[PDB]
Design a protein around this ligand. Sequence first.
Ligand code: HEM
Ligand code: HEM
Lengths: 735, 734
Amino acid sequence: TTFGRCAVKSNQAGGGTRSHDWWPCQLRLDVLRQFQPSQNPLGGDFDYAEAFQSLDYEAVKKDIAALMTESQDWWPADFGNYGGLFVRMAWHSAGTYRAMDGRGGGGMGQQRFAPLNSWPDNQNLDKARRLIWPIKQKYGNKISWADLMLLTGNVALENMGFKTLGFGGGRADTWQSDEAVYWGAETTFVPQGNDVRYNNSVDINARADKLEKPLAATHMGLIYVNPEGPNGTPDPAASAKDIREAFGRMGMNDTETVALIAGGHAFGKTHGAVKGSNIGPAPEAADLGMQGLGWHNSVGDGNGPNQMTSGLEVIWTKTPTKWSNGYLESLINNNWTLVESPAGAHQWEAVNGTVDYPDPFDKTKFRKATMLTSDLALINDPEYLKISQRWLEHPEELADAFAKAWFKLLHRDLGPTTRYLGPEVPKESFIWQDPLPAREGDLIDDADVDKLKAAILSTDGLDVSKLASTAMACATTYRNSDKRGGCNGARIALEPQRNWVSNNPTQLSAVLDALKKVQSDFNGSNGNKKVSLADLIVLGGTAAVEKAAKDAGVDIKVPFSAGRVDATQEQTDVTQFSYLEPQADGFRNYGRGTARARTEEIMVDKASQLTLTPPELTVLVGGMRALGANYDGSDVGVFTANKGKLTPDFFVNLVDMNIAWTASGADGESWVGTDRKSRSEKYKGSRADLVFGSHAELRAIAEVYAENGNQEKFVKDFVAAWTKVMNLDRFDLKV
Amino acid sequence: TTFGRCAVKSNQAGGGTRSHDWWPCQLRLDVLRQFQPSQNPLGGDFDYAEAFQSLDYEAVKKDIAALMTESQDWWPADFGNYGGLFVRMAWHSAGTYRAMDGRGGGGMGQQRFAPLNSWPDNQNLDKARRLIWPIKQKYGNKISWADLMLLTGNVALENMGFKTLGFGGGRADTWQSDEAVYWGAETTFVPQGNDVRYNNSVDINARADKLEKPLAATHMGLIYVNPEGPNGTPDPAASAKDIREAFGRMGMNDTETVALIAGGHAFGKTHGAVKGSNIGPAPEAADLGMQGLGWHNSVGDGNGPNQMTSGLEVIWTKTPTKWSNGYLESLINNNWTLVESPAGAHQWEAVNGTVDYPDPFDKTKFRKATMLTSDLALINDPEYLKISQRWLEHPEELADAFAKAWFKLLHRDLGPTTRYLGPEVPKESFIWQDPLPAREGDLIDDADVDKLKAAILSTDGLDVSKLASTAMACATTYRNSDKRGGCNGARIALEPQRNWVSNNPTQLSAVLDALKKVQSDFNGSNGNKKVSLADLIVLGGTAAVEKAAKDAGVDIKVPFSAGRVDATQEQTDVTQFSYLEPQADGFRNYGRGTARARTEEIMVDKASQLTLTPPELTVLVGGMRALGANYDGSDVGVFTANKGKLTPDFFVNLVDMNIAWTASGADGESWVGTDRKSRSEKYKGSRADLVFGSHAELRAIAEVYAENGNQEKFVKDFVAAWTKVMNLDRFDLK
Ligand code: HEM
Ligand code: HEM
């Protein structure tokens, strides 16, 4: 078979040519159908946080520590200690994170599913996960796989003599492969897997800063970089440039990068004992006897001294089970020669070095010092060299930076600190956690909420359209992958969001100033009760939705949950927040897509990050149009003569056959609706508008809301979806 | 570019290389994740039957009838009447049904989604669905698209002079493409789309009866056969062989087949006015301006006299808006010559015939008679000719056969008669409805249930394992695609099921005889109360599950719903039921895979037909193993020392790393589990067993049930899944 095709064509269980085969360019809704409660064996009403709070956390860590030195005959431990392997397992779990889109990381425990379970860089971590299973079996639902993989690495470091800052749990497991992540477009893995992401450039120094966005690895199938140098060329200088690019795409700076690599490579070793032709299929391609494992090695028992993982055979320190400064000392104080491992791969050896690096299965036999090309990178770049030279003589500074970087790596996608669970959460707050202050004052009650809604709606310069638009602009910065963004913090009032062109800065300024007058009037006239700007932004949109429903003939309660706080600019990092800036926004008819992602594809991707189903996406868009909630107040998509009233007029008018739609410019972004009988232009629409009348599955939902009869249902469903979106980041509240 | 690949590679919304790309042979669970309640815009709570029964049904029909003659300028009506178009719409919705697997048909309204919305043979039915949308708009949730597409064809026949038997509603809408159906493996549509289904044979006579199972169309993208003959060869005799094969695979016999074709082709016309180069992309490939329509025709306004659908230009009768015998009269009385339509397709013309066939847009202009190659088939086969000859002389017989066959076409995937809604459900019971009687005596209550459970669990020949096995064997015949099978009717006790090898006939006979003893003891000694064998089979299994739970240390009420009836053998056609016989049954460790599908694939397919989610499939298999419920009573997969007790031992032992699993048979079906320490063989497993420890998503669920502390959860989840499966056919309780 060619790529993506099985040689046997199944006739069961979804076998056969499928719609995506015939029409591969059509928009797919798959990413809005993942992670559904039916699919979760634990039930939709399972509360991980509540289960983890009953965990005997201390006993978990004790049992992990014990397991580190209990070698299992099916995968013997190097030096009698799985620590190194476990550190690698946790670092690869967390290490797929990309800062730009916030995807990857360890927070969904996705290493245990395709494709990550079978990436080349994850070779033999199937064995690592299997070794820790008995811990999961003992503790059951009270620790997730997601938390356990990372806790295991953290405990491993501590038991090998490196004290970490602490740990937070809170990562609920997921139950299917996350097929929403764009890992690249290549049709091959490392050693290939990177023509597309370099746009066919092969000049390894020149291309290193030209890696396709948002990717954070130099080949499909790798965590960050190729350990044998760029495209396998053993040039440490050029490897350094790759490392900078890749780690930068993961949200790490130079200090963090050197700390992580020199910290991690204090421990363990690589494996490259036998040629790769001896290694069987990865877990997703292996036979049923492998029972979820892969890479079966036919030499010997395939393990112990015959272990083959990367094809390199490097032991960095003389004490691979104990924290030390041996990595930097070897790196800088040895002379390096290029040699081949037993499997044939490029590495470096100190061929006149001391013969005192221990063998992993013989306590009396030794070898010379070795390094990877990607380790030599750290003394073949001026910035990395300065850091390496400083830490060579000041290892406490390495230790400090490593502790902080390791914490950040494990917890980058955990979200706000209100998500962090367990008895050793670090007390220090860090900028990457998007910190929030404690609240000013006592919490407003329902009577205060009712008075503030009336005050907001009677304030000059505030109307239903602007209020709803502003609240949604603030809310849709949320992304579920790394739990960043949302309305808490009022970060729309801060840089960079206050200047995002998609927020219409001049309008936003006037809206916020009017909310700050409501705030000033309330605060100080209600005793100890005080209201934040964050709550007023959300309450103003809430009030607008309620009023728009009443003005459509429907009296409905629009729920509001008080208690958001206002971030400071010092808690709001410009670079980090720039990554949340939309290039197109279908809720507010802003912007457009590009060749490789169309306007409506961006919208569906955004909806996946908001955890919206297809019906919730569809009701929100149509309600936002009815509300006149475009970012600049345009009439594009505003297919209603009742603007500000919460009706399904967008749907009704979109599917009216007396309107004919035609393209207005060259790029397919703008569309005109013409009345067929009168020949007069009636409407202007965008792709975000018209996809709901074109995609067969979305149109089926559009038709529900356009049905004579479902008018009350439209309001009910809009209000439910609004409430969901406003509350996504409310981890401070429970249930 | 490459088949199945977009030239532009999106980086959003699921764009990028995907796990199914890297490992295309791996088992996929997608078919267990369809039709989820969160996807349904109506809500999970929505009850279609209740909505329909409040529908002003007569008014719907009245509005359809009026629409028929309300020509719309964007798709003008041939002869001023949309009736033929609407009949075609209905017939194509219902016409994808395959009897053998029970898939396709109109019962899910799938014509409105990919791929059916864009099949060649459904060209311009996008316009037909759009013309009826104002009816759907007016009546809302109270009539589904699925019901409305078929009702519209029904009403069209009645408003063109053809009285049907009646109609039943009840088809709830679905909300995504059904990607579980095997339509074929070809990577092209008609005019190609058939190398795989004929195994590369191009010998049109010899291959006709060799069409790949369970397919029911001669090319990918067609409803039944090619109207231009086999592979476009204009040979009516060969076309007849394809028709018999395809219609046979749809459950229709020779009389049904002629009745459907000659009945349908009373009405309307084909469209072939301009060449195919003038036609734009199908709906799934069309630009946003098309707003779900496709096949834009660039000649004139693309419509009216320029309509292009199939490429053929045939008008069968002189009165295309009114029922007549003109189809058979023309077919038999004319001399036919092969000609080209304006689009270049070949068709047949009576070149010396009368010039009295009406033009669809000009009341002063006329043409000669025409027919398709597939129409001439009916007088170029001995059995079809005999039928055509008889009905030429006795057209009432065609009308009676067409009424009956049309009713069967539209309703056979609707399920049991208890699902049929509305005021004109035909009174005649038909064998293809798998009919069921009304109940005997008064309904058992919970006191009677308690007495019966205690008797069943202490009767000669019965035990936990046997009862659980027997109840699951009867239940897993259910298939949601056409709502056939299940436990209602006690058809496991009838032919052919009572002699299926998968049911272990000698053990089944001893189980059934024991349950019939319990029945006989209860019936007649409880006044007018009577209990059915069907209730006893399910009650027995349910009681067994409850006891097995108790013995595992969990006290749980296992709910039982009484009221099933016993079917008679007269109501149980043996050929019809042969289509429910499983190739493999993973719940009971029966069977093996084929050259096309592995054992575990068949299991996931079955689970999809049961509407199971991946946790429900997993829990059931592991519980059935704990129960010792294999079809043959073997120890394969029975990884427990406590057989008959509802523990999660299957999972615990499957994931024990002290066991190494290796292949035993050449065929990949058998596996041995060896203790790594002692080197002793401990277990035998199947593929249905071991897949739960291999597939990463299934294994994640197996792990949950293997975890300390989850023994109660295992029982709870097993009981919920058991209850769901036992009750799948209980449409009488709705
Ligand atoms: C430029 C970045 C890095 C590269 C290219 C790299 C490459 C590698 C390779 C090739 C192996 C050997 C796998 C095998 O054959 O078993 C490995 C092992 C390992 N790496 Fe890294 N690494 C990087 C960063 C990290 C970081 C950031 C950490 C953790 C903080 C880490 C911790 C480890 C550990 C502990 C092992 C030893 C595993 C064992 O003993 O089995 N590395 N690394
Ligand atoms: C051997 C089986 C059959 C074949 C090959 C076949 C073929 C076709 C073709 C090629 C068209 C023309 C589509 C177009 O160009 O507009 C058509 C139209 C039509 N068919 Fe059939 N047909 C079959 C069976 C049936 C059946 C079973 C029915 C209904 C009971 C039916 C009812 C209709 C009607 C009413 C039209 C006219 C549509 C209009 O007026 O727009 N056909 N058929």
